[PDB]
Amino acid sequence: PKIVVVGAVAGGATCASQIRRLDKESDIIIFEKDRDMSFANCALPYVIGEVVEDRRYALAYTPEKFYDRKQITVKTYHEVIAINDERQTVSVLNRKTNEQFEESYDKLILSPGASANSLGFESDITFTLRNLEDTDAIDQFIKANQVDKVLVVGAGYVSLEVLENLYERGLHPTLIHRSDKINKLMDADMNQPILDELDKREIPYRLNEEINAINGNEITFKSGKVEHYDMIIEGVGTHPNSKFIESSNIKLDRKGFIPVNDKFETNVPNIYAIGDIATSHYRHVDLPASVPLAWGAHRAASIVAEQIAGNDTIEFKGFLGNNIVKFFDYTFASVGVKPNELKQFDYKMVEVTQGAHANYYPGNSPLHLRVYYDTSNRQILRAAAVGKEGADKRIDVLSMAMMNQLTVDELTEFEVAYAPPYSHPKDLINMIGYKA
Amino acid sequence: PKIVVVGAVAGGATCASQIRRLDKESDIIIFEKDRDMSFANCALPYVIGEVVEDRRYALAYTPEKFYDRKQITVKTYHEVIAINDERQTVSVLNRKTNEQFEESYDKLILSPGASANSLGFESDITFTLRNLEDTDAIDQFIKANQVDKVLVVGAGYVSLEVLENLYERGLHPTLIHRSDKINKLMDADMNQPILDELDKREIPYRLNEEINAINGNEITFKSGKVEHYDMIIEGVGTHPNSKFIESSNIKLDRKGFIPVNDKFETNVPNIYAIGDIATSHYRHVDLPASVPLAWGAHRAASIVAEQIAGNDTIEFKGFLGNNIVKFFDYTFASVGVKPNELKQFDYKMVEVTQGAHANYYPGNSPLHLRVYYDTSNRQILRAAAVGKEGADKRIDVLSMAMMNQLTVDELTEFEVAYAPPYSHPKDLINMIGYKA
Numbered sequence: 038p039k040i041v042v043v044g045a046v047a048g049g050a051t052c053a054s055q056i057r058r059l060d061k062e063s064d065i066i067i068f069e070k071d072r073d074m075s076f077a078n079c080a081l082p083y084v085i086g087e088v089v090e091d092r093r094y095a096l097a098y099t100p101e102k103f104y105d106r107k108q109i110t111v112k113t114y115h116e117v118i119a120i121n122d123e124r125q126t127v128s129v130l131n132r133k134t135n136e137q138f139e140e141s142y143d144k145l146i147l148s149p150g151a152s153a154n155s156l157g158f159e160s161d162i163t164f165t166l167r168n169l170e171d172t173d174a175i176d177q178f179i180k181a182n183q184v185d186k187v188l189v190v191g192a193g194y195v196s197l198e199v200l201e202n203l204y205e206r207g208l209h210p211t212l213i214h215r216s217d218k219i220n221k222l223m224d225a226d227m228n229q230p231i232l233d234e235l236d237k238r239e240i241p242y243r244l245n246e247e248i249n250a251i252n253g254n255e256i257t258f259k260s261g262k263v264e265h266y267d268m269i270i271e272g273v274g275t276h277p278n279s280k281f282i283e284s285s286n287i288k289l290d291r292k293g294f295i296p297v298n299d300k301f302e303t304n305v306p307n308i309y310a311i312g313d314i315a316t317s318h319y320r321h322v323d324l325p326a327s328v329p330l331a332w333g334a335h336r337a338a339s340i341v342a343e344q345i346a347g348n349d350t351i352e353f354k355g356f357l358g359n360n361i362v363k364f365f366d367y368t369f370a371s372v373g374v375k376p377n378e379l380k381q382f383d384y385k386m387v388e389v390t391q392g393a394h395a396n397y398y399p400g401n402s403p404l405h406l407r408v409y410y411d412t413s414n415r416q417i418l419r420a421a422a423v424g425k426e427g428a429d430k431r432i433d434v435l436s437m438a439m440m441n442q443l444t445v446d447e448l449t450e451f452e453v454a455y456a457p458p459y460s461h462p463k464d465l466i467n468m469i470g471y472k473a
Numbered sequence: 474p475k476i477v478v479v480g481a482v483a484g485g486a487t488c489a490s491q492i493r494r495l496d497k498e499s500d501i502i503i504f505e506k507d508r509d510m511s512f513a514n515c516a517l518p519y520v521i522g523e524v525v526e527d528r529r530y531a532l533a534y535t536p537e538k539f540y541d542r543k544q545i546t547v548k549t550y551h552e553v554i555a556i557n558d559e560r561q562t563v564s565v566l567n568r569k570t571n572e573q574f575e576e577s578y579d580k581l582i583l584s585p586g587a588s589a590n591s592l593g594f595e596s597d598i599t600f601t602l603r604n605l606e607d608t609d610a611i612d613q614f615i616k617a618n619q620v621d622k623v624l625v626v627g628a629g630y631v632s633l634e635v636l637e638n639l640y641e642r643g644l645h646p647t648l649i650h651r652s653d654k655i656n657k658l659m660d661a662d663m664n665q666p667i668l669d670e671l672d673k674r675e676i677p678y679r680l681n682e683e684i685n686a687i688n689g690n691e692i693t694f695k696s697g698k699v700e701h702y703d704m705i706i707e708g709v710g711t712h713p714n715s716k717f718i719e720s721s722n723i724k725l726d727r728k729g730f731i732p733v734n735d736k737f738e739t740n741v742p743n744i745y746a747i748g749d750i751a752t753s754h755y756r757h758v759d760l761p762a763s764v765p766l767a768w769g770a771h772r773a774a775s776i777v778a779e780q781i782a783g784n785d786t787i788e789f790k791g792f793l794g795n796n797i798v799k800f801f802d803y804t805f806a807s808v809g810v811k812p813n814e815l816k817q818f819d820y821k822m823v824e825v826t827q828g829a830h831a832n833y834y835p836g837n838s839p840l841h842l843r844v845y846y847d848t849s850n851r852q853i854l855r856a857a858a859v860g861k862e863g864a865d866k867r868i869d870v871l872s873m874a875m876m877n878q879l880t881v882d883e884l885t886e887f888e889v890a891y892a893p894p895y896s897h898p899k900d901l902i903n904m905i906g907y908k909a
């Protein structure tokens with residue numbers, strides 16, 4: 038089949054590449070509206086921080102290389118502007134010529150992802166971070182204006198990694214967020230170490246704070262405070278790239294996302310949707326779910342590859358919502374339903390704080406583990422973990438537990454790999470089951 | 474009921490402690506043959522190495538604190554020398570006065586553990602490591618004799634930690650082992666980094682090497698080498714402390730261990746056995762297992778407490794054999810059947826080797842993950858991981874997967890927590906399922 042793919046990054050490039058693994062005959066074409074394919078989205082703050090300085094780590098492929106290795110045609114600077122599903126084509130604007138044309142398909146795979154929100158000020162010094170063009174522009178602005186003070190707006194994982202990397206590059210960032218509900222995938226009371234990591238390093242922040250006006254480098258805030266910055270990086274959420282889909286027969290939800298079944302099929306035959314654009318359901322509870330993260334784009338890429346050119350009995354079973362962020366010395370990680378989704382069950386909380394490993398062993402640090410569970414069937418609903426060490430391990434295990442519909446009580450039976458550098462003969466996880 | 478517990482460390486003190494939590498009225502007494510209760514066996518190599526420096530860290534309790542805190546009577550230097558199971562008493566030698574007496578019980582918990590094998594030489598410079606007494610003596614001997622060259626005999630995990638600690642303390646160990654099966658819970662080819670860590674450090678070692686004769690500080694070896702050593706630490710295996718048991722009606726297997734059922738009951742009513750002395754079966758396959766490790770001591774302890782004083786439907790489901798050792802910069806972890814037990818299955822092997830986390834993120838190292846599965850049912854029999862980073866995590870998750878009978882093909886569905894410091898969007902674990 039002729040396969041057309043919209044978006045040439047996490048969902049899109051990966052999915053094309055998986056299809057090629059199974060099917061060597063079909064013509065595959067990818068339209069990417071911007072300059073680069075398969076940039077490393079998650080590496081971007083580390084590029085800013087000058088932690089990652091080799092471009093080969095920023096960009097996995099170019100169109101020419103992708104064609105030479107995989108025989109996939111990738112057209113950068115090509116924006117898909119409508120889906121003509123009845124005729125089976127897409128209308129595509131070549132942004133270099135401003136010429137538009139139709140491309141036909143047997144299968145269409147939508148992986149357009151999300152775009153960053155802007156705050157809306159007319160400003161030369163304000164940037165958002167979503168792709169590698171952004172990254173290059175922030176790098177260049179910094180060098181050209183010898184940037185010292187940067188204002189970081191927003192408090193999700195992207196803002197946090199950017200803040201940290203700016204600091205490590207040797208700039209002086211300040212963090213503002215419009216409310217006190219920072220890092221909101223994490224339990225609100227378990228986020229305090231973000232604030233302490235800021236204070237320890239004397240990195241200024243103000244919560245319940247917003248930019249009110251901008252006049253060159255003079256920034257006025259809603260607290261009334263007035264300050265000079267050389268740069269602003271705005272991480273205030275994202276919106277789905279689905280405007281171009283609205284005129285088609287593809288069902289969109291009222292937030293502009295694409296509901297799909299366990300095959301990543303849309304309501305329209307032959308059209309798939311994957312990545313941040315796509316919503317599905319939870320694996321362990323009967324609720325809808327959207328998990329705009331990297332594992333999901335990759336896993337769906339694999340399933341859709343199967344659906345099309347391999348084993349169509351392979352189906353998605355739903356999301357767990359496993360996520361994680363590093364911020365300075367601390368790790369923040371959770372899986373399961375979001376905090377606000379908890380209200381939908383009759384639930385209970387158990388928690389424990391302990392050394393990640395043996396106390397006598399050098400370089401310990403308390404690790405806080407929290408698990409919520411359904412009171413009517415004892416099933417794990419959500420877990421959260423924060424600590425300088427071993428949060429990732431605990432949440433990866435609870436992720437596998439949830440996968441298998443485990444009860445909180447059965448956590449006493451988890452057989453841990455024990456030695457002093459690694460955990461405890463009764464691990465925090467076992468302790469969760471005992472304390473339940 | 475009146476509860477007598479034999480042995481006051483990982484199984485014994487724990488189990489006593491767990492009973493008291495459920496049960497306030499019963500008289501509990503523990504007899505310990507040696508000087509100290511509740512010492513930290515696993516801390517001891519780190520006490521030798523002075524990585525731990527304050528013995529408060531190596532001793533969780535004293536009889537007086539245990540009695541004030543939990544009202545459990547502990548008698549140290551009191552050796553149980555026989556079980557009179559028909560009358561329900563034990564005979565106990567007071568080692569300080571050399572006088573014996575009998576102690577009646579309604580419930581007898583045996584957690585006597587294992588003792589170190591000796592090579593049997595008459596030698597003032599030879600020590601084994603098994604409790605705090607042994608640690609103090611080794612420590613004292615090093616100081617008293619200005620110990621420089623140390624011969625470390627044996628290559629199990631204990632001997633390995635001891636060797637590393639002697640090194641880090643500033644001494645000069647040499648390692649020998651009677652065969653080349655070093656660190657036997659790990660796949661032999663995966664143990665090579667042990668040998669690279671030694672080589673890199675110029676710590677000498679010789680495998681398939683034995684001691685022939687000791688003449689003062691002059692050691693003669695099987696190979697013909699004759700060397701001078703200031704000290705010898707011998708880790709040549711252990712044997713079960715079951716001699717005091719032979720005259721009773723308790724069933725002993727031919728090696729000295731006690732077969733127990735899923736309640737940790739012996740063939741004799743009212744007598745339980747836990748810790749290293751007890752043998753059970755695996756959880757994922759129908760085979761006998763004995764896993765003489767801490768997790769199993771503590772887990773049995775809790776199960777016996779519930780049996781006696783709590784919810785008696787709580788039972789053991791079997792071992793997985795999860796285990797782990799740090800040696801210098803590397804981790805060696807494994808879980809499932811042992812290497813030799815693989816022969817009892819029709820099996821295949823899959824393996825990945827990739828960075829622990831994002832290649833572009835600093836301090837990356839290659840992590841080797843191997844998974845065995847049963848060809849007849851696709852079920853995971855055994856997993857093993859080696860790398861400076863990330864091994865503990867993978868093996869924990871795999872253990873959680875095996876606990877649930879999960880197949881190798883379902884590892885593709887494992888939702889990892891992904892950010893560049895922690896893993897990949899398609900984790901090593903996921904890669905196992907795709908490569909299978």
Ligand SMILES: *[C@@H](CCNC(=O)CCNC(=O)[C@H](O)C(C)(C)COP(=O)(O)OP(=O)(O)OC[C@H]1O[C@@H](n2cnc3c(N)ncnc32)[C@H](O)[C@@H]1OP(=O)(O)O)CC(=O)OCC
Nearest residue numbers: 462471472482483486487490491511513514515516533767
């Ligand atoms: C490994 C060598 C192998 N391990 C050992 O040799 C271990 C030696 N261990 C012992 O002697 C006993 O393990 C202890 C140290 C005396 C502890 O017994 P215990 O587990 O009953 O612990 P507690 O001191 O009573 O409790 C401390 C924290 O755990 C909570 N807890 C225990 N059990 C609980 C149940 N069933 N439900 C809820 N909570 C429970 C306690 O409440 C206590 O809480 P807190 O928050 O800290 O006040 C090397 C090595 O293992 O050596 C080092 C272990």
Ligand SMILES: *[C@H](CCNC(=O)CCNC(=O)[C@H](O)C(C)(C)COP(=O)(O)OP(=O)(O)OC[C@H]1O[C@@H](n2cnc3c(N)ncnc32)[C@H](O)[C@@H]1OP(=O)(O)O)CC(=O)OCC
Nearest residue numbers: 046047050051054055075076077078079080097331907908
């Ligand atoms: C953020 C999350 C952003 N996520 C992203 O993914 C950023 C952009 N990613 C991409 O554009 C694509 O995902 C790639 C990396 C360009 C496509 O890679 P792929 O997954 O199709 O695998 P290949 O590039 O073909 O690499 C081959 C190595 O993996 C083995 N492999 C892949 N698929 C396999 C299946 N299905 N079965 C068995 N083996 C499979 C290959 O054999 C191949 O192995 P080899 O050892 O090299 O021979 C931040 C971030 O994540 O950015 C960075 C990711």
Ligand SMILES: Cc1cc2nc3c(=O)[nH]c(=O)nc-3n(C[C@H](O)[C@H](O)[C@H](O)COP(=O)(O)OP(=O)(O)OC[C@H]3O[C@@H](n4cnc5c(N)ncnc54)[C@H](O)[C@@H]3O)c2cc1C
Nearest residue numbers: 044046047048070078079117149150312313329330331892
């Ligand atoms: C800075 C940053 C850090 C991140 N860190 C992490 C992390 O640590 N862990 C994690 O799990 N996830 C992380 N993510 C998110 C992760 O990168 C996304 O979840 C993933 O890339 C989503 O894949 P996608 O293909 O749906 O979206 P993207 O990879 O964003 O790709 C969508 C592409 O489609 C193109 N496109 C959109 N509309 C059109 C059109 N009409 N025509 C042609 N092309 C179009 C866009 O230009 C874009 O390139 C991070 C994201 C960013 C921005």
Ligand SMILES: Cc1cc2nc3c(=O)[nH]c(=O)nc-3n(C[C@H](O)[C@H](O)[C@H](O)COP(=O)(O)OP(=O)(O)OC[C@H]3O[C@@H](n4cnc5c(N)ncnc54)[C@H](O)[C@@H]3O)c2cc1C
Nearest residue numbers: 456480482483484506514515553585586748749765766767
């Ligand atoms: C140096 C060292 C490092 C270790 N590291 C690890 C590790 O990293 N991870 C891990 O999982 N496991 C480790 N272990 C083993 C772990 O300690 C055992 O699996 C666990 O202690 C078993 O508990 P137990 O109660 O059966 O044996 P023990 O804890 O050894 O307790 C047995 C006690 O009973 C007493 N006793 C025996 N016979 C009698 C009698 N007749 N009367 C009275 N008292 C008696 C003994 O004196 C002994 O004090 C290590 C062990 C050692 C020695």
Ligand SMILES: [Cl-]
Nearest residue numbers: 084087090176
């Ligand atoms: Cl640069």
Ligand SMILES: [Mg+2]
Nearest residue numbers: 121122123284
């Ligand atoms: Mg029309």
Ligand SMILES: [Mg+2]
Nearest residue numbers: 556557558720
């Ligand atoms: Mg008799």
